[PDB]
Amino acid sequence: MYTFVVRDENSSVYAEVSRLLLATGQWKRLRKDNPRFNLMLGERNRLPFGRLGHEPGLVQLVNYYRGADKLCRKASLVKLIKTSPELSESCTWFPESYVIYPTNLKTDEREVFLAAYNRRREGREGNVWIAKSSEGILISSEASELLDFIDEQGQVHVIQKYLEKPLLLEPGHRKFDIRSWVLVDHLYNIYLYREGVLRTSSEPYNSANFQDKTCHLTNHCIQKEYSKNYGRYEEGNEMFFEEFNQYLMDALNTTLENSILLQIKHIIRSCLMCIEPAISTKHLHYQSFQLFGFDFMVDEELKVWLIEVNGAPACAQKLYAELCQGIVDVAISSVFPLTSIFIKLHHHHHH
Amino acid sequence: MRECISIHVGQAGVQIGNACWELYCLEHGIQPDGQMPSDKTIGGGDDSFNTFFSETGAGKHVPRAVFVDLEPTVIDEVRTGTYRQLFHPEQLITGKEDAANNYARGHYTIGKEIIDLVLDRIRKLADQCTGLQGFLVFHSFGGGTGSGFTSLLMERLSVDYGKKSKLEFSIYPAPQVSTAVVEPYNSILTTHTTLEHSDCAFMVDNEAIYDICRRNLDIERPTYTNLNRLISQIVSSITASLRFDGALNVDLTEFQTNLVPYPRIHFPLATYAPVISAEKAYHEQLSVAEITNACFEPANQMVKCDPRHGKYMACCLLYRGDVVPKDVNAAIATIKTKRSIQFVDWCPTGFKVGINYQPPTVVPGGDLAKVQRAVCMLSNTTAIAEAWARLDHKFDLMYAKRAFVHWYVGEGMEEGEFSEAREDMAALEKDYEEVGVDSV
Amino acid sequence: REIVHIQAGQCGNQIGAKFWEVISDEHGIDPTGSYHGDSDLQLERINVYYNEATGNKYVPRAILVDLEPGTMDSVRSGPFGQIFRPDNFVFGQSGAGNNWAKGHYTEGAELVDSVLDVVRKESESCDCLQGFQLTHSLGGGTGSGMGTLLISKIREEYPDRIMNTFSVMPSPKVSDTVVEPYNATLSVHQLVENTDETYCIDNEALYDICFRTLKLTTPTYGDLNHLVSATMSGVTTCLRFPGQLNADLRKLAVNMVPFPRLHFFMPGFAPLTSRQYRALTVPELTQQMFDSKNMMAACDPRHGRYLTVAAIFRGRMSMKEVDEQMLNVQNKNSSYFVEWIPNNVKTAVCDIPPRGLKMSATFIGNSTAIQELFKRISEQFTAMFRRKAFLHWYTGEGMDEMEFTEAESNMNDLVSEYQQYQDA
Amino acid sequence: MEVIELNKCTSGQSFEVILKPPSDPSLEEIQKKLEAAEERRKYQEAELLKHLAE
Numbered sequence A: 001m002y003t004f005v006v007r008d009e010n011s012s013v014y015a016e017v018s019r020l021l022l023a024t025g026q027w028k029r030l031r032k033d034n035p036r037f038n039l040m041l042g043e044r045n046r047l048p049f050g051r052l053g054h055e056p057g058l059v060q061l062v063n064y065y066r067g068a069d070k071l072c073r074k075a076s077l078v079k080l081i082k083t084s085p086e087l088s089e090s091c092t093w094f095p096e097s098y099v100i101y102p103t104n105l106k107t108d109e110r111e112v113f114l115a116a117y118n119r120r121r122e123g124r125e126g127n128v129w130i131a132k133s134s135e136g137i138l139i140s141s142e143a144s145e146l147l148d149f150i151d152e153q154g155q156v157h158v159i160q161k162y163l164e165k166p167l168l169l170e171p172g173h174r175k176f177d178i179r180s181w182v183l184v185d186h187l188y189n190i191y192l193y194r195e196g197v198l199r200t201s202s203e204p205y206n207s208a209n210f211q212d213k214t215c216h217l218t219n220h221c222i223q224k225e226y227s228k229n230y231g232r233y234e235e236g237n238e239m240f241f242e243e244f245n246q247y248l249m250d251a252l253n254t255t256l257e258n259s260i261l262l263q264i265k266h267i268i269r270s271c272l273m274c275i276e277p278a279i280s281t282k283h284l285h286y287q288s289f290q291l292f293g294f295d296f297m298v299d300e301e302l303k304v305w306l307i308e309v310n311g312a313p314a315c316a317q318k319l320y321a322e323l324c325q326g327i328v329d330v331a332i333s334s335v336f337p338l339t340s341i342f343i344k345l346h347h348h349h350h351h
Numbered sequence B: 001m002r003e004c005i006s007i008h009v010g011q012a013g014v015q016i017g018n019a020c021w022e023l024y025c026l027e028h029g030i031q032p033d034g035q036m037p038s039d040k041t042i043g044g045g046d047d048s049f050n051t052f053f054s055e056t057g058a059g060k061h062v063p064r065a066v067f068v069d070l071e072p073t074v075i076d077e078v079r080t081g082t083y084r085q086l087f088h089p090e091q092l093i094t095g096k097e098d099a100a101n102n103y104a105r106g107h108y109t110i111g112k113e114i115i116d117l118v119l120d121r122i123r124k125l126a127d128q129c130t131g132l133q134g135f136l137v138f139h140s141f142g143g144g145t146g147s148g149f150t151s152l153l154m155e156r157l158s159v160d161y162g163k164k165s166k167l168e169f170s171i172y173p174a175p176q177v178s179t180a181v182v183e184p185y186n187s188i189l190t191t192h193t194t195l196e197h198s199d200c201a202f203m204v205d206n207e208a209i210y211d212i213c214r215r216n217l218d219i220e221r222p223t224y225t226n227l228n229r230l231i232s233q234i235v236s237s238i239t240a241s242l243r244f245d246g247a248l249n250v251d252l253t254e255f256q257t258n259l260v261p262y263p264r265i266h267f268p269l270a271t272y273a274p275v276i277s278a279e280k281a282y283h284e285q286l287s288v289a290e291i292t293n294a295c296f297e298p299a300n301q302m303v304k305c306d307p308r309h310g311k312y313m314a315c316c317l318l319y320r321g322d323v324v325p326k327d328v329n330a331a332i333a334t335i336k337t338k339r340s341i342q343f344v345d346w347c348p349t350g351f352k353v354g355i356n357y358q359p360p361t362v363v364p365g366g367d368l369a370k371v372q373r374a375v376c377m378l379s380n381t382t383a384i385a386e387a388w389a390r391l392d393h394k395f396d397l398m399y400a401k402r403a404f405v406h407w408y409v410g411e412g413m414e415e416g417e418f419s420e421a422r423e424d425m426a427a428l429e430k431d432y433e434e435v436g437v438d439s440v
Numbered sequence C: 001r002e003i004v005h006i007q008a009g010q011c012g013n014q015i016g017a018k019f020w021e022v023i024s025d026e027h028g029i030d031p032t033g034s035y036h037g038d039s040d041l042q043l044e045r046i047n048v049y050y051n052e053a054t055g056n057k058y059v060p061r062a063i064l065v066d067l068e069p070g071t072m073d074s075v076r077s078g079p080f081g082q083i084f085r086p087d088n089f090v091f092g093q094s095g096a097g098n099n100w101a102k103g104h105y106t107e108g109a110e111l112v113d114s115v116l117d118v119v120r121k122e123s124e125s126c127d128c129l130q131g132f133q134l135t136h137s138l139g140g141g142t143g144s145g146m147g148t149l150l151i152s153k154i155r156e157e158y159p160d161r162i163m164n165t166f167s168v169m170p171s172p173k174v175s176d177t178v179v180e181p182y183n184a185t186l187s188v189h190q191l192v193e194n195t196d197e198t199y200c201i202d203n204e205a206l207y208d209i210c211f212r213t214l215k216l217t218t219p220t221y222g223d224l225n226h227l228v229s230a231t232m233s234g235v236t237t238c239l240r241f242p243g244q245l246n247a248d249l250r251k252l253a254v255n256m257v258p259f260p261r262l263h264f265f266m267p268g269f270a271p272l273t274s275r276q277y278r279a280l281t282v283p284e285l286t287q288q289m290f291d292s293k294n295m296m297a298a299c300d301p302r303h304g305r306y307l308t309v310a311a312i313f314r315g316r317m318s319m320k321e322v323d324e325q326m327l328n329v330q331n332k333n334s335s336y337f338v339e340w341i342p343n344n345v346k347t348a349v350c351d352i353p354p355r356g357l358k359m360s361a362t363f364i365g366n367s368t369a370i371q372e373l374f375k376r377i378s379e380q381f382t383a384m385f386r387r388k389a390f391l392h393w394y395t396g397e398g399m400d401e402m403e404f405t406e407a408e409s410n411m412n413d414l415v416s417e418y419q420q421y422q423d424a
Numbered sequence D: 001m002e003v004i005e006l007n008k009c010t011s012g013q014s015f016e017v018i019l020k021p022p023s024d025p026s027l028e029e030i031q032k033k034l035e036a037a038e039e040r041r042k043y044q045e046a047e048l049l050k051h052l053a054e
Ligand SMILES: Nc1nc2c(ncn2[C@@H]2O[C@H](COP(=O)(O)OP(=O)(O)OP(=O)(O)O)[C@@H](O)[C@H]2O)c(=O)[nH]1
Pocket: B009, B010, B011, B012, B013, B015, B016, B070, B098, B099, B100, B101, B102, B139, B140, B141, B142, B143, B144, B145, B146, B147, B171, B172, B173, B174, B177, B178, B179, B180, B183, B206, B224, B227, B228, B231
């Protein structure tokens, strides 16, 4: 009888893993601060990694990788990509991004940022940007506007190139993003969940008024709120992969695998292999797994762009059941024994 | 040459002291009766080994050590043991009633009645010192004597020898190695009163030493003799530069200069490799690269913690055996590329290296195989604060209910010393997090 | 080091005699006090319970107390009767009539100073006395009333030694008289105040064990005392045999007692034996020793939470297996150990097994479930006291009803204190 | 990677390699504290002996 504790009540996905585990009849939940657990489903903030792996006679496992937040905070990720030789400043799948500290706080790139802007305006290039942080987003061609706005707010912001030429689904002439769920187990196997989702805009994309941000922001929250046509084409403004595949076959004569998924698997693999030496628990006295949400954009040339990585994602309603069963299968029962829904991401090219 | 006095307090400090002096004798060629044939300057000297041994007219080489236990059974085994002749009776000090795992009983009650006798015995050793640098203090955190008496001794040594340096070797408590239920209390209390009196302190988590002994020595249930011979190797690694010719860490002050830039953050992590079983039939010797790499595996540290999630303030490699500078730099080069080694911004990213060509000596019949090269890394990383987090949490659980508190007040301690000590530790954890974390 | 042992009253002397018979046989010492063993481990800690005599004979540091001479004459007549220092037989003639008041205030007061004189002579011959252990019952008059008077006097004269008792709790299933709840309630208050650790031995539990699992249809006091002897040998192993744990009660007291009044321990033994040959495995020892059916206090551990636990394994066995099994009852039943005392289970081992077994385990629980014992005594007390029944036996020796009201108030307080930590 | 302050002797060598440059109470206060605890003990003992005398 394995033992576990729950320290995030507000997590849709690990609530279901909690119940799935009880139903085995071989897992018993302890109280929050009982230290004699096998498994910790821990808090989002200030998870006490320093207290794991010190209980004699207990293999211990937590559902978070210590250090994985350098992938999962906007400013961190930018700094990680620019500084890590495996990703490089010359990184083809990440949008141009610059970290910007507000002036109250006074590292920061804001004047090497305008180098690029000035280069671009004198270059007659498309020159929309987007400022963002880790709801408070500004899309503007006015650089002199953008650094205005960052400093009115008090936390650090990322300025990133805006994807002016996105792939738009028809009918709708409308934007979307792709969310992938990836599970990294204690062995640092990288598992892509076979089902993703497209979070679609229900507004036609208009490239001349970025001041209105509902055809520009595909967040499920904003679409159910502000936009006239939520639910119009897709249930919950969520398109799944079988549909998006068929559309690509009919509309563009390709498939999801060739045109988009190869790129996505390469981005996932590259991100997680980059931080693997910093967060691996291979020789550690406790063990980690974690579920990530990767968010990609597709431009009209079917090039895939990573926009962010989410360290504590929620699932799509229809997929909770299958994903959560899969987390128990490969993350938990792998360590505590009682056709796969994941694609193992491994590549060993010789050079 | 400047002399160093070793002070061993309580059971843990005495038994580890015996391991250390056994090893030292084997390393310097001193026999159990104190004779050192190779010492050609008979009855005197100022060689490097003289910092730890004094000499008598007859040619006896005598540890600059005092043993102190509040009950006799542990030091009696010194008095009757195979190194009986090594020590002067005046250096072995025993009470008759111990501190019963109670910090307050060792500090206040039993301490008051023996502290002056100990300082007088300590003074007899200081008086045969042309130039004393200070003290090496061996004790457990969890014992009543090792915690309570030691902190009283540390306070008085600050008074009676204020310009001297004081280093500690402190066994941190682990439930796997027999443990009183109030050892978290004792730990926090003695850390709080010793913090300003100690210039540098090497913590040894009995949990890490235990697991090294099971995993690398194939000892399924390690004894204190197993644990202490390993600890003794590590301590010997750390002190060898005071006992041997060289130019790194040549006096106690250099330990603080080289390892402790911030004086409160004075807890260097020790990592040691390789530990090889003497029962291992076929063993292939490990290289300079391989043993230096092993310095960055947590399974080899004296305190299990994760240095990737902290920052370094200093780092020394002490090698013993067949090691030459260019292999160290080649090994360091390859390691910086494959490993998370981040320093605080105001320190250089660099390694002070010391090589002594004599490989580690092993106690005959011990558990450690002889090796051709070994290294002990001393890194002052903020990741060691994990051990304070663990201790403090356990302290918090018990003190919320005042469990066992009545035992301390009964010795004359005031409850408020508990919360004072816990508040100091609260500051220390935040210092560590200031230095070693940048904001999320 | 040295412990001075006292046994008071009928039950105190019968169990105390059989304790000294059992452990003297362990240590090789024969009925004339002459050693005859084959190991030096038998004599390394022999000084804790024995004085060395002229001729290096071993004499128990044991004082034998009663207000009548009957039982002690049976002891002097008994198997090991001559092992005892004759000067240490201290007895009155009148008895205490199962009357706490006679034990504590009248008959016993007359005898107590002479008991303290023998205590003092045994203390002075001690290199470094650590404290005292008393065996007595709480349901009669001598062990209950005089025993607690002695405990009070001894604390006055030695306030810094450890006081330790093995106290037999009365039960209507093994009952001599109706006034036992009165005697026991009066005694319990003394124990809360003036001992450091009390082993609660419930005659209820000893009966059920003898009946339900030893299959003894008509258990005698002899059967009950077999169990008590075996348990007493087990809890005193560290006091009598070499080990990594030395022989001192203070350290045990410090690690078992988080709050001074809650020092009432539920003992247990495995395998439960009547006076077989099957090998008991380490997993079996461990499962049994924690089994409610092996507890000598008729309380259900699952009704409370363990504050602290001490466990003592005897025999040749794998401590790796011992460590494993201990870790797995605590990891598999972590509900029943308070989370606010980390690592509150301690395990000791001793190579030497008791007579007739190759492997035994002794359990020592400080559980809040022990309140059930005190509630039970309290309900029996109250059922008589609300009618002032049988009080005249006590008022006739000078006691007032107020002192009864105070004693039950004290025991109900102790019960509330246990309850407070079962919910904390 | 600079290798500096090399020192040799017959026992061994030492040096420093740099990957990258930077970016007490009185005796009387103690004996007082020890005596204040001692009187807290002797008080509590007097409270016990007073209680025992009652
Ligand atoms: N590594 C190691 N730890 C020890 C040793 N002896 C005791 N310890 C540990 O120290 C703690 C107990 O402290 P002790 O040194 O035995 O206590 P003490 O200082 O003698 O004080 P009292 O016995 O309370 O008077 C426990 O955590 C032990 O595991 C030893 O020889 N080696």
